[PDB]
Write a protein that binds this ligand. Sequence first.
Ligand SMILES: Cc1cc2nc3c(=O)[nH]c(=O)nc-3n(C[C@H](O)[C@H](O)[C@H](O)COP(=O)(O)OP(=O)(O)OC[C@H]3O[C@@H](n4cnc5c(N)ncnc54)[C@H](O)[C@@H]3O)c2cc1C
Ligand SMILES: Cc1cc2nc3c(=O)[nH]c(=O)nc-3n(C[C@H](O)[C@H](O)[C@H](O)COP(=O)(O)OP(=O)(O)OC[C@H]3O[C@@H](n4cnc5c(N)ncnc54)[C@H](O)[C@@H]3O)c2cc1C
Lengths: 576, 575, 52, 104
Amino acid sequence: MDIKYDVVIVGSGPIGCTYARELVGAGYKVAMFDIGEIDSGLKIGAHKKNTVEYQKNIDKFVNVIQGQLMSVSVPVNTLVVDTLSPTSWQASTFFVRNGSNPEQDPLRNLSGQAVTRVVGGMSTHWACATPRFDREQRPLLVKDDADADDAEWDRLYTKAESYFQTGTDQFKESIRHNLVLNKLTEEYKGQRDFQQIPLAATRRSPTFVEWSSANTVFDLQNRPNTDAPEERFNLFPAVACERVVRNALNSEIESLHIHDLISGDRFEIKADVYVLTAGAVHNTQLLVNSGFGQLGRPNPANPPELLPSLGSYITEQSLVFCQTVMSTELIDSVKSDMTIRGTPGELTYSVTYTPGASTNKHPDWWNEKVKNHMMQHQEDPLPIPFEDPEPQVTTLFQPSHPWHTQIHRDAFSYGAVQQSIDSRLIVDWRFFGRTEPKEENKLWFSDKITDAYNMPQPTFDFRFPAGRTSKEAEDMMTDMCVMSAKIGGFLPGSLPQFMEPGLVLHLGGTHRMGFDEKEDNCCVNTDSRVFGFKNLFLGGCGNIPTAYGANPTLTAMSLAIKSCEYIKQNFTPSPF
Amino acid sequence: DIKYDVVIVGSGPIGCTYARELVGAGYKVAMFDIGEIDSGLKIGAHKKNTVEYQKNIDKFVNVIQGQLMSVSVPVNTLVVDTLSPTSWQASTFFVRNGSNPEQDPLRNLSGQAVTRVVGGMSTHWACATPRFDREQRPLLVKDDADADDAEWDRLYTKAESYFQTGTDQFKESIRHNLVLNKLTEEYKGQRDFQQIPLAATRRSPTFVEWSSANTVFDLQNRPNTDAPEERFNLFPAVACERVVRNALNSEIESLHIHDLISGDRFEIKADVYVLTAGAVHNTQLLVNSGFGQLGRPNPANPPELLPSLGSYITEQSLVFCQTVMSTELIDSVKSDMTIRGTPGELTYSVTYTPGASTNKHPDWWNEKVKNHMMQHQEDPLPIPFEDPEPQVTTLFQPSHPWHTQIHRDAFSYGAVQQSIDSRLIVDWRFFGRTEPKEENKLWFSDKITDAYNMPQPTFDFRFPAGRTSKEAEDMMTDMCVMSAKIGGFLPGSLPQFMEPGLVLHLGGTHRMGFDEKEDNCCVNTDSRVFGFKNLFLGGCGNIPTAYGANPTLTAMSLAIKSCEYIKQNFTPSPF
Amino acid sequence: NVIQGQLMSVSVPVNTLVVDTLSPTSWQASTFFVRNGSNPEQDPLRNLSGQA
Amino acid sequence: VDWRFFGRTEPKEENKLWFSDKITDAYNMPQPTFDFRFPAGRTSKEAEDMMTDMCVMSAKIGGFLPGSLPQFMEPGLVLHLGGTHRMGFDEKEDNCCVNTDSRV
Ligand SMILES: Cc1cc2nc3c(=O)[nH]c(=O)nc-3n(C[C@H](O)[C@H](O)[C@H](O)COP(=O)(O)OP(=O)(O)OC[C@H]3O[C@@H](n4cnc5c(N)ncnc54)[C@H](O)[C@@H]3O)c2cc1C
Ligand SMILES: Cc1cc2nc3c(=O)[nH]c(=O)nc-3n(C[C@H](O)[C@H](O)[C@H](O)COP(=O)(O)OP(=O)(O)OC[C@H]3O[C@@H](n4cnc5c(N)ncnc54)[C@H](O)[C@@H]3O)c2cc1C
């Protein structure tokens, strides 16, 4: 380790890797630190799902996700266990056990909130949905000029899409995908439009999809190297970043205080520019541990003096979930162009179609797949081929239906798909609500309790706002039930429900963006620069100040690209 | 150079034993694995050795669950009759979701699973490496028990070095000692309690570097700067499908592989062929090559080559529970303290006399207890929050013919919840020995194939009547009797037999003996396949005995002996 | 089932189970208050909960 | 086959059944409240030896039925409560409520 760099980046997730891509590529001497470790194979920070074995066994990936997500704030447990043997040590009170947080009100939590500490962050296991926000969900980047605002957003989103390798046709040969998309399109009669979920992914074969990750954005290899001989980049894993040291003036950051987890030692690191991309929760913890906002339980008799909006106006999306079992009608419809003679298993059983016939309801390639599956597998009672790729359908947020939707199959911490119903029939429904930012919804940090890395313990004080957020959430639940019925009934064991608050992992607004610190109740400006500080920048979903339902990461990356343009324009790389 | 001195199938710890031996001895080695490097820059290393997992050890259970893929899942017959009327609804229990229609659900090892990753199961195992005593141990020397003992002592010693096995990495756990000392007191000399021998090196009071395949051999391609005269290439994502027999059945001529990334298939040439793909997949590879018999066993048509392959399979019975430490034991932790006043109040104090001969515990223990009780007066227990886990065993003996572990560690089952303090909880796992019986089989379908288009494994297994069954129940009773001395059962973790094969200690699938016919076996004591000059098998599949203790060290020892034979009989090519 | 129906618990302590998947529109408690005939005098850890 | 083993509990003054002066039950009578733990010492040592004896004894007949594994039942489920208005010869010396004619 040198101790002096042009740029230091805290966190190796996709957003940190956005700053690395832009700034290493611009010739800056860059260091990036992550509290977590390299594990994803030789491609550092890559998606863990990109193994042949996971793609042959995609339900097991749910276990990988569950293992790496560490709960943010677990309240004290009050479950009664009164069948201990009389000889066993038996509590007299519900005392603080097993890492729990006594500061946390169990009834005002985001209990599902969790973080991932590994190189590449959560992009080592995410579901890769990268939609754009329309105006209603998005913060303004230009005031009093909507055309210019739309233009700037389209410019940034276009660049973010190419960084992630976002596309909308990787699942276009799936029979299940098309069956569902086409049925929904027909049922809604132009009242709503449906499309493939935009996904950060590149298909490699009919049975393998290279899902994108941080690695896609920046390969995280130390530089200079053979492929980039004039670039300078060093990644330092297993390094807990603990503070950014303020000057007394609060006009500049003077160093970064780090703890090397392997040797145990602490060091101070110097850069011209400091970028914090540690996530929505941990950016905030770092800043609060460094003297921004206020440590301890919020006290309005005693408002912070620096960045008083930090950790207020936090938003998390309401999430509803169910799975369905495909209707008899839609299954029969897969094979509507086949002529069938005889009984499966008999010597003269026959499934045939006429290629190119004007009366066919499906393209030739679909009918070829169906006929071959039915003929080659006469023991199997479905017309859908065994390795048909999954459905990836959406109708995007609109004023008339102000929630994001995903009608798909993918792996999440809660996905448990089971064994008695054939998986070809099963579709997942996830609808995502938008949450109004309210001052009273907070993420704060204990002045007494510490987490496993000896940092102040995160504590939430959150409820979904009454009024619009709550009315929309329940209308959203209703829309899922109404819409999913057009495809099939609910799968027993996956009935319509609200998911534990935060399980969705789309927290925002924890260090929010706006034009004016006071008037827009915010922490950073539209260059993601922290107000008052010449050289401190924050990236991530914690920047997003609006109520949004769609998946936030693409939008956070686009803000990061704009942040990088300010940096390139105002700091000089050191001579190489 | 698609010609090698040695090819090894599988990068788990046993393949890595062959690589360590043979790379070291100057051979041009290639190793293939069907899985991929997914463990960090240390190739094939233990996935538990991250700071984050060691601070969240209970979460590792999810990692193991994720990487164990079931070997044989029978057709599901569960009735779901609450589907909506509009939903497609089956009329029969057809073959769904990759299930194996050949498999009888009542004669399965349903808990059996495999791990396809570089490093194999050593990327997530619990690192217990006991030696087998004579009763559980295969013979290497016939009729000279002193010579047999000496050969095993040498091989095991070398295997323990390879694994970095030790027995005192937990000596400064209060919980460990609390449990060990109480058990030794209660058995009044009938049984010996000691630390589980563990393949691990402690790095700090809160961090242990668990050993893995990586520890045995680093899996870096060679030559490299640290090993300039060595020759090693590792080829991940390569499914190995058949070894080609000459017509004489005296030599292997080729290893046929399928590169999963490019999709292409190749025929690899070596002087020496080593199969170390696990007890299930070594057998699959051999059967797909014409050894044994493909398909449902047929007594009226016994195989001509290797007739014992896939017969005499053994798996251990496993019983498990957790307990909550007794109030007596918790009080005894603080037996040396003088405690006055009430916690949280001004007058409260906890003192002890350092070095006093009337103390039951050493000063390090009393200091830790004193500081915890004084610094955390809101906590009602005397055990420090970061105390390491217990790691206790009494090893298999004639009068108690099961292995025991009295400990905490991560496996695919048995996760904790949050209601009982973790410091009170202890896991009890007792492992039975299974008599080898010709009717217990692992065979492969001639029509159903698995996810890599290879013949589908199918088990025909029940625990033998007689000794095996009687000992399994006596073992359960033993666990109930012993655990009671430490505390009552933890609700939700009551004493139970685990699903057959969850324990993943499968042996005897390609078993070892002196004489193919007389010892009903597939390899000799050099682990060489009878009749074949240049084919060797490594792993637990080789072990032909009824054993209770954890098998991997014993398989590794057998692999070292195999390497000695290779070194005596083949010459490395010129570098 | 007949036995289960006729046995009425003697002392049921206040319930502290967390239910955090209510819809945002549903009335949602701020405290673990005395619900459903429970006994606030009863220490849940010094009970005969099975008594009926 | 079902196995139910029943332990004996030492009578201890501190183990109580009392009645609220504020909370009432469904029949508007004072609400019963327990203050109970199994006594340490003999009651507790016997209870756990008892568990062990069930496991030892039942093994001679068969293994445990999955789903009905050896356990302690919730305190009181057994419905054999005693000593709430206890008998003895002398009210004071035998710490009791009724004499051997069950007269108060
Ligand atoms: C299973 C799952 C599914 C998802 N699906 C989607 C999707 O479909 N679409 C979508 O947009 N979003 C999805 N997400 C969310 C997406 O992964 C996150 O929004 C995104 O990764 C955030 O990027 P980031 O770089 O800001 O933070 P992260 O990805 O969280 O990375 C931040 C990092 O900084 C580190 N760190 C934390 N503290 C410190 C410290 N003190 N010092 C040093 N380093 C530190 C971490 O170890 C970590 O790698 C999903 C997430 C999960 C887990
Ligand atoms: C959670 C758990 C805990 C355990 N704890 C312990 C412990 O405490 N003590 C103990 O002794 N053991 C225990 N074990 C078991 C121990 O892991 C195994 O016995 C040991 O890893 C066997 O090593 P091996 O090299 O023979 O096989 P494996 O580790 O199974 O490796 C064989 C490999 O070959 C591969 N392969 C398979 N088929 C092919 C093919 N066709 N072509 C190419 N490559 C192929 C695999 O991908 C794999 O890497 C545990 C296992 C688990 C999962």
